[PDB]
Amino acid sequence: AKRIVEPFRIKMVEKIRVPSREEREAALKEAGYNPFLLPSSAVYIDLLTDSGTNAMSDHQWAAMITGDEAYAGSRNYYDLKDKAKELFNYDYIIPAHQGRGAENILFPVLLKYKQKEGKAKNPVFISNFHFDTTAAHVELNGCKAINIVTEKAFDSETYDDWKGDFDIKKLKENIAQHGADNIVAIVSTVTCNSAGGQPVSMSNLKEVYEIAKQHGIFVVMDSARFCENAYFIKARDPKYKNATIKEVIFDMYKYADALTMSAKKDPLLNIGGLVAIRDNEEIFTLARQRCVPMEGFVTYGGLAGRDMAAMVQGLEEGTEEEYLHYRIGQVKYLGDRLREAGIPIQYPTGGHAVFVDCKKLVPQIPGDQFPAQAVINALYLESGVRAVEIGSFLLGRDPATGEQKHADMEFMRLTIARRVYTNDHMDYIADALIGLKEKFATLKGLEFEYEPPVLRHFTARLKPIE
Amino acid sequence: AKRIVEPFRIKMVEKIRVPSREEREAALKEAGYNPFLLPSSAVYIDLLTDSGTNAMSDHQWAAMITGDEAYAGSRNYYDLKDKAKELFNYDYIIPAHQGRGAENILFPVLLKYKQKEGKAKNPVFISNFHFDTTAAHVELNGCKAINIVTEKAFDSETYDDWKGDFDIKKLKENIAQHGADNIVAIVSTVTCNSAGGQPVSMSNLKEVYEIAKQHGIFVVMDSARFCENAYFIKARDPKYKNATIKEVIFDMYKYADALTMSAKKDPLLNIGGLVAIRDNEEIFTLARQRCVPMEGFVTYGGLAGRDMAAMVQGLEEGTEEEYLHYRIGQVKYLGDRLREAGIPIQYPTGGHAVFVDCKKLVPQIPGDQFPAQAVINALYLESGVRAVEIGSFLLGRDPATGEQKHADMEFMRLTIARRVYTNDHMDYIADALIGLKEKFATLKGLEFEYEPPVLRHFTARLKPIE
């Protein structure tokens, strides 16, 4: 395990504290054994998500101070539009308040556009792996979300360079089955969050886009972690060994038609989202027509002007290779600490989190009883670290049948905010989970007390089994 | 006209600039003669809206600096929930990114809830006046938006205390014609933005609420400008002559079942919304379930934690009587400057804006040629001040008819951001408008060029008559 020093020093700190065991126990049962329902005051180190918890730089706070709060035509909107042209070569932007705001703007528009000629009678979206809000927006619009990640992602301890890849064979199988007239869009998620933050190769992106263009299928790049994906391409694709990160990104986005981005991840924000379209002006116009009632006027999209200003600056800092090297290396450092102690993880670690394989850690719990959630709850009670489940709990049920969706992966996700915790916090996380080696065998699954019908895991309340 | 001293001093400034006449003429042509498409760099004083353009206090910025950016369970969420319980006596909150996000959370939930009871077969919403985004959500969900503002609102020059009131007789008539089963909700807009930011009396709110409870009709207070409404109730209802603003607010919210609020208005924010529900926990659960995919997790609703921090402080400052006296008095000052010179305005002035009655100012232009917009563009080229139309352009077209909705009013809205401009800025605005006295008789309408089917006035491009 190699500690990689920070390419920055600390400018402002925020106090954290360890609540007592009795605090955690009470807090956990008040939360219905769902850490999502814990107040942050009951949490020590928060690894629930890497979304919106990032530490910004002094340059980003300075851009916020001068942000233009105008309702129409803010200076920062044109800065953002120029930045998107520079980074992605895309000519149209619509800001959004966050990632799922951007999907709410763009996915219904693509559905209605697909349906112009009486097509898309049984519409589907295809992705390497739709994430929760992305899949929810697909199914909310009467569509069907189809995930075709390479099965190399299901073998956690076996190394592979691109565990986020599409399965090209499955892609052509699904185009054959559903027909090109039913494929509303192909969504390229970079990195692929559900597979463990794993990168997608340039040739995979290129091949998917080529196949999509042969059949006239629109391609949207889900871009929340595009910079981490770009680093992995440079690190592992020998054709880009000597390319800058911005060069890698520029090429990535030749293989999509639009992007939806949660700017709360790689652009180092606490809020903010973005739709960008390469050249299709009709889609842009219709998406502006939906942005207005749903998010806000087209030049702020539900963002304060200061947040668009932070986004312009963050979109630069997120691409800096020295920062990416440290950030991705801190995640690798945590994973190696765990792997060197026998804890099974998705190998190699992704860009933003360590995914602990709980199928192997607590095999006496079936997936329908949420084995990873039992490990998470145990970790919290022994240390105050809050982590999140990426398995059967999160996958939800099938909108057609109503039964549990088959989860090929039961992960506890140790999600790392950008520039927030040190390697010594990592050591704390590792040692607390490593110290649980004995308790794992005697952990009990969990049963629903209250299940919402869409995105259940966010607000569900659970009870142990026996 | 009377000038009221600020109950505060200036702590931070932002430069503004007057663009040369040539720049304003180029900019407007580029903007398709729709000032919504003008960049703020081409606007001197911006009166397009009082939403999100407010100046915050130093306590609000200090609150943002210590805002808890936790994804789930931010301590600012809990402070917000205590503040709603203090101000409104409501027990449930869901933050939203702004007002139209709050509406998207609550309104489809109220429709769907009524439909599951076998009701809302031909669903309508009834309001004193739905504002544009509010009515757009009503229509998007398949319902009709009915406005029943008191007829005194159309009598522009004639003073009345409560021009935002419901017409009780039309309330009963519509309940009779559509049936209580089809009324999805009554929306009490306070102040009534579309009537000229004019107040709704306490006795009107109370009688409306009593009528609704008789029929089992849910009542929603659209609370964007609730503090401005509360001040007017104190200024004009002798029953509250010696009450605090908070006591007036506490009584107002006895007469709704929930509220949707744009926190970008009276809470003095640049971004932010809120849903609060008095005590119906079922609606709260359903709205929480719709929040998660649309806005964000239920303890931040698409806001950064700093923005929830600003909101808690802003709701306290928004209610301070000496501030409101200054704020509403600045609006009155602007209105009095114009009324002195013979410009017909909605009288008395509302809380947030002067409404210049363009039916009486420029009678030669037909209602279907948007007379108020002709005045707006003329004001912009003359002074670099940007205003907004509240007439036929805004009303758009009638659903199911594709026809211009009947516009009882043609208004140019001089919208005043909170704590941003001085009374000397007000004199500039007034002087520029007065100077066009002789050119009012020689103005013409405009023709559509690109008309959006919903909320057309935002991105529509226009062209002069000749």
Added chain:
Amino acid sequence: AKRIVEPFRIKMVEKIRVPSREEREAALKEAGYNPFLLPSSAVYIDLLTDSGTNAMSDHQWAAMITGDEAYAGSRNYYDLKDKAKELFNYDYIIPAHQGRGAENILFPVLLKYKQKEGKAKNPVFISNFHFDTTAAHVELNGCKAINIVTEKAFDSETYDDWKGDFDIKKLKENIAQHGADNIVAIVSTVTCNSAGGQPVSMSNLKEVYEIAKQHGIFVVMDSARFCENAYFIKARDPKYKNATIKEVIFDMYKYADALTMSAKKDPLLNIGGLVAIRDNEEIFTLARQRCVPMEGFVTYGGLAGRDMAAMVQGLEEGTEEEYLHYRIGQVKYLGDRLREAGIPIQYPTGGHAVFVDCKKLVPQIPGDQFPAQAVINALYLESGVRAVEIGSFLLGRDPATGEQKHADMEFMRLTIARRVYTNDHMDYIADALIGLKEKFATLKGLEFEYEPPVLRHFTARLKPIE
């Protein structure tokens, strides 16, 4: 009077409060009838000083955020050094924590440098008027502080373009009387604070410098309000009618060898000072050697790095003609209000304050009973406005025999912080003071309870003389 509109808008506000008459009564009594000892919570509008109370721009706060806090070699030190070179064409800078820090750095260095030839045996400084701290550092170093402003400044009500000018005849007469070898330095105070903020013409500065170079005398420019002086030169000198402010400043500093500066005035700051030296490297070295033990290392001089950063931006904004026109026009507006009601003031008003001639306002109180303080207290008890005395109380005792220094002017200074108050605040001050006209004749003087030996007007406690 004429109100000039702000060339900016408000971005952040700070609440102020009017304390009751009963509070003012108790507060002034506890403060030893000396408003310097009032807590700010007892003041509504604070006209005590324009020093360090200014409102900064968003750009200045953005600069503070990215300030370099390094102990040696802060990035902002080199920006400040380039700024001084651009504005003044001076090659050396030493930052200081404020104006009197700069004086404590430079004046002792100028004295010992003058002594190095066996000279300065009876040392004096000559100025148009030494400000209080300036004169105190002169006297504390064993030297005499000579003031020789134009007698036009004693003709309060009579207009003159240049009431801050040196009396040239007195300059030459003091040189002949004292000998050039005794004049440690000539201090050109621009604007002349003690005369009423009144400007020094460019030809007056040029002639003073030429006389000083004729005699080998070092010339320091006390530059706290150099930007207000530069404006007045462009307004009133036909040679500079079409120059830029920066061009005027560039020429002003041709007529000095160094400057001391409180950046708490015209650079729009809350803290900060500066020494800059044109090209005498020996003085620079000796001043650097004094800086280290008194102020701090020579690249921050007792300033945080953010404050140096704010100083670089402020030095630019303070020279903007549009801001200067408004700022100086705001002071003129308050003066004309008082001048129109028959209140005698120093006319024309200067850059930063209105000086009310209390010698004429309350002719019944002798100067040793400090008549201006009588007015000040009355204005405070009536309105919560706090002003300051610029008369015999401020002038103090002579260093020999403790005799009261004969004051030629007994002023009440209404000092206006930059970009902080509106013209409606100005209206409040004027109406308060205008409303006291029936009570001026029935006012008494004051006598000492505790007199500090140096700068008594700051901590002295007074008792009314009845």
Added chain:
Amino acid sequence: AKRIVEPFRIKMVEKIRVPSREEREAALKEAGYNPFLLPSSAVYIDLLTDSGTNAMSDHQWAAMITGDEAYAGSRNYYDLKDKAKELFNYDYIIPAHQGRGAENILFPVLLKYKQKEGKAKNPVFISNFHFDTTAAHVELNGCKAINIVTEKAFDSETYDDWKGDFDIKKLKENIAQHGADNIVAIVSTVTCNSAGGQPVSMSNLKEVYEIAKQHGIFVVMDSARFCENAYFIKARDPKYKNATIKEVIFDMYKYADALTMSAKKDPLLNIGGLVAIRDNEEIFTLARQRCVPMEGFVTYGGLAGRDMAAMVQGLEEGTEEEYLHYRIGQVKYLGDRLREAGIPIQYPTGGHAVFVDCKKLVPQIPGDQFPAQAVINALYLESGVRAVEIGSFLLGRDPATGEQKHADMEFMRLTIARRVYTNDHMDYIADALIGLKEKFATLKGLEFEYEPPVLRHFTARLKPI
């Protein structure tokens, strides 16, 4: 060597970068081989000082935003006055722009007050050790600055609990030789910076104070690093084993009559200083009379209001035991990395810095050829880290003679700002210096090329010899 985790997380970052070797060479040549003259742009990790470079907390920045900028009577002045009453039990405060401003306010007052009785005809100040500016202000007012730190501070590698203590025998011996009438003040420096940030025990402070009240001698507590001293008292004195930091602080200040403080240290600021006085109103009145011409009005003292508000918050945060345990533990960690690799240091490490004994690292470099500055220069060229010298380059020239290289200690001070650098930055520093064991044999001394007659270290020039 034990890494202690942060009791906080990062809210805001500032970017740094390692200048290429050529830039470091160019920078050092242009800086005249004096790192005090390097632009920070040429510096990676700055160890020049722990003064004014600290990272503030979000509560401190929020305090700054609501700061009351009023010239007289700022709300934050009254908050600061109530804070000093709470922490120290002292009744009077005067804010100051930084520590040496506080010294300029109070020390000349103390001499004048002692003179007005007919005493202090041959005036001296006595300290466990006067810091540099402190001693400079003493000597600028015609007095002699006497240092009488325990002799255990001179045995660099031998552990002692309290290497900052007063030598009590020398204290009594100096009171006997100079006379109580000539001792203007006793200055207790906590922690004792010039000894290596080494703590003073409570019983030592108490005994110094007792001897001084017998002889009528005023006692000033130089409090730049009083929190670190309180932590060490709690760590090493069993009587305070179960006391809180604030109780230890409350007890320390029973043994002084006044304090001067650089708030740029333990109160976690970038600027700021403070004078506080226990109960002597006359000394307070005289100090105010000096504050007004030197610093500013008595309710802001040359500080912006935002900085007084920060100081009120930082005074609270600087006493937090979990923070102090982390902060002092990180310095200990750096020292242990070096000590475990054979690098001689002042042991145990102080509260704010590791001090490296360079005479043992560069033997064939004598004192007048700047042995500690040679290591520092080599270290910067090799790593871009800037450290400071506490040896014969700082010591300067004998009066009317030559190099006062009577360097009792030839130290390189690796000074650690609070809450700024991680333990992985600590590793970089240690690995860089440890990596210099090979090139130590180059033994390249340093020779002047330009020199000032006074304050040479702050701005001199030299060349390798």
